[PDB]
Structure 1
Amino acid sequence: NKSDAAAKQIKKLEEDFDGRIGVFAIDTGSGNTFGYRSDERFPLCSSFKGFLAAAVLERVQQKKLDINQKVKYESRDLEYHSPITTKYKGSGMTLGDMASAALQYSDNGATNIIMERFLGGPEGMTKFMRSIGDNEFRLDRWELELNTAIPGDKRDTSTPKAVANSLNKLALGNVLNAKVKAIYQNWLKGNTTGDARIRASVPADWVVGDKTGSCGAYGTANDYAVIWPKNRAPLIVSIYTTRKSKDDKHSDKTIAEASRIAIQAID
């Protein structure tokens, strides 16, 4: 019905920028969902870093790791785009701060250190997702090589749907106890890279938590978000985009729009 109209508009939008748009959104109040290409594979980019953060908090809650434990890395050669790890190289950082840095500043240093020392690499990352009943998600490579975003390449991809369900399990559901879920929420709420994406699509007194991704190839970018409107149950929104050519740039505004259309569909 209204579902058919939102698909028209999404279709228009991707043809407008000569690329591919994938959306999944859920209204946690009514059970309403909407998907456009919600089953197709898209490159993850930094977006899995939000799940990494959750996988840590999981280990913390089972008492396998302490959120305050020093993590030192003074001799490491820090990957490109390590703004937070770089400023604390000489003192180190707590496991908590490191995890949140991976999520809030998309910190590559934070990402790889955590996966090599606590999470058991990409395979370990994949295993974490399998354990929340997400079968699409697959992280294969490390930063930065995982961001190649070659069309057709299934490495380091998921689907909008699977990303939506996962965020929902993690941000709103059963996986984390009350105390830890709260921490996880605040981490997403404090994300700094997502102002022009899903956040731009919502009334500015809704509370949003998000994690963005940008590949730097094939104009590949994404965002996923948990949203608390004012008088209303939260929404989950998940938007993934690619473009036809290698040199193409990502489009914040397209994701913004696709979020806008998505949210109207489940309204």
Structure 2
Amino acid sequence: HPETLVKVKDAEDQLGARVGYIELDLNSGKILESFRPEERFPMMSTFKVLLCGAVLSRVDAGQEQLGRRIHYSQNDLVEYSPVTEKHLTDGMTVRELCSAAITMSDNTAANLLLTTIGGPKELTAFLHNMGDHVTRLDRWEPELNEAIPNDERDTTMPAAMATTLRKLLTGELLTLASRQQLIDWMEADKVAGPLLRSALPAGWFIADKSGAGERGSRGIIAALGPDGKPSRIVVIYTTGSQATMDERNRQIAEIGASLIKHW
């Protein structure tokens, strides 16, 4: 609805920064509304969904097992690692790592998973092979959040990210079991309270992944819908703003209220 684009532009005014936006129909894959759809924005932690997508593709192919255990070193630990910090002694399974990366945004968990697939370059190769020729991961946590203006490293475009998420969640790309697991992890997202979830009426379904970075970068990708079933994809990114975290959160939640209102 055009009213939602009014709110998106209003957000851009309040934040003093670009905002990228896609609302996508989950079944048809067609864009319902868009703003700055082919401009680059830092992915931040939203990439972790794509990462576990690549991991699940390997599971599907019998190249990886969700139960496989990885013991790791305290030397691998980076800032914000609430789960991985607690399992130096016992280690963590691939399944537990994807849970930590997606539901808690655990940074060490993401790096360990990147290691299992061959690093950022291999995530990028995975994306190209699934038809996303623009999204690219280049660095590890936490450097990938640097968000240097005009830097194309570790960026996506809202239109590409929406299409990629749709393919991961509903495509033939992953088996049903893997699609089910991937969306389950996103539904269990514990760290996106103040964003779309804060505008979501009871009874609605949401599976999401948020991100935050340097230079005011903030974003979220989600599959959501009424009556406990997802029916649309929403992608929101912003970068460049000097606004506080609360103000950036509020603008995203307000965009969410508008798309819900005009659903």
- Tell me if 1:255 matches 2:252: yes
Match of 1:237 in 2: 234
Match of 1:99 in 2: 98
TM-score (norm. length: structure 2): 0.92
Distance 1:213 1:109 in 2: 15
Q: How does 1:51-200 map to 2 (within 5 A)?
A: 51-116=50-115, 118-200=116-198
SS in 2 for 1:76: helix
Distance 2:166 2:124 in 1: 17
In structure 2, relative to structure 1, the CA distance for the partners of 1:262 and 1:41 (3 Å cut) is farther
Tell which deviates more after alignment, 232-241 or 218-227: 232-241
Amino acid at match of 2:13: E
CA shift for structure 1 position 231: 7.8
Match of 1:49 in 2: 48
Amino acid at match of 2:236: I
User: Which digits, 9 at most, give the CA deviation of each residue in 1:54-94, with x for residues without a partner?
Assistant: 11111111110111011111453411111111111111011
Answer yes or no: is the 8 Å Cα contact 2:49–2:182 preserved in 1: no
SS in 2 for 1:83: coil
Report how many aligned residue pairs link the two structures. 260
User: Which digits, 9 at most, give the CA deviation of each residue in 1:176-235, with x for residues without a partner?
Assistant: 1121211111111101111111222322211111111011x2111100001132187611
TM-score (norm. length: structure 1): 0.91
SS in 1 for 2:83: helix
Amino acid at match of 1:22: G
Answer yes or no: is the 8 Å Cα contact 1:34–1:262 preserved in 2: no
CA shift for structure 1 position 119: 1.3
Distance 2:60 2:153 in 1: 30
The answer for unaligned runs of 5 or more in structure 1 is none
CA shift for structure 1 position 28: 2.7
CA shift for structure 1 position 8: 2.7
Answer yes or no: is the 8 Å Cα contact 1:129–1:137 preserved in 2: yes
In structure 2, relative to structure 1, the CA distance for the partners of 1:231 and 1:205 (3 Å cut) is closer
SS in 2 for 1:227: strand
Match of 2:20 in 1: 22
Amino acid at match of 1:68: G
Amino acid at match of 1:228: G
Distance 1:11 1:210 in 2: 23
Distance 1:232 1:101 in 2: 24
Amino acid at match of 2:237: Y
Amino acid at match of 2:108: G
The answer for unaligned runs of 5 or more in structure 2 is none
What's the RMSD between the two structures over aligned residues? Answer: 1.8
In structure 2, relative to structure 1, the CA distance for the partners of 1:232 and 1:180 (3 Å cut) is closer
Match of 1:213 in 2: 211
Tell which deviates more after alignment, 73-82 or 62-71: 73-82
- Tell me if 1:225 matches 2:261: no
Amino acid at match of 2:36: R
Distance 1:205 1:195 in 2: 16
- Tell me if 1:201 matches 2:190: no
User: Which digits, 9 at most, give the CA deviation of each residue in 1:156-187, with x for residues without a partner?
Assistant: 11111111111100112211112121111111
CA shift for structure 1 position 27: 2.3
Match of 2:7 in 1: 9
SS in 2 for 1:239: strand
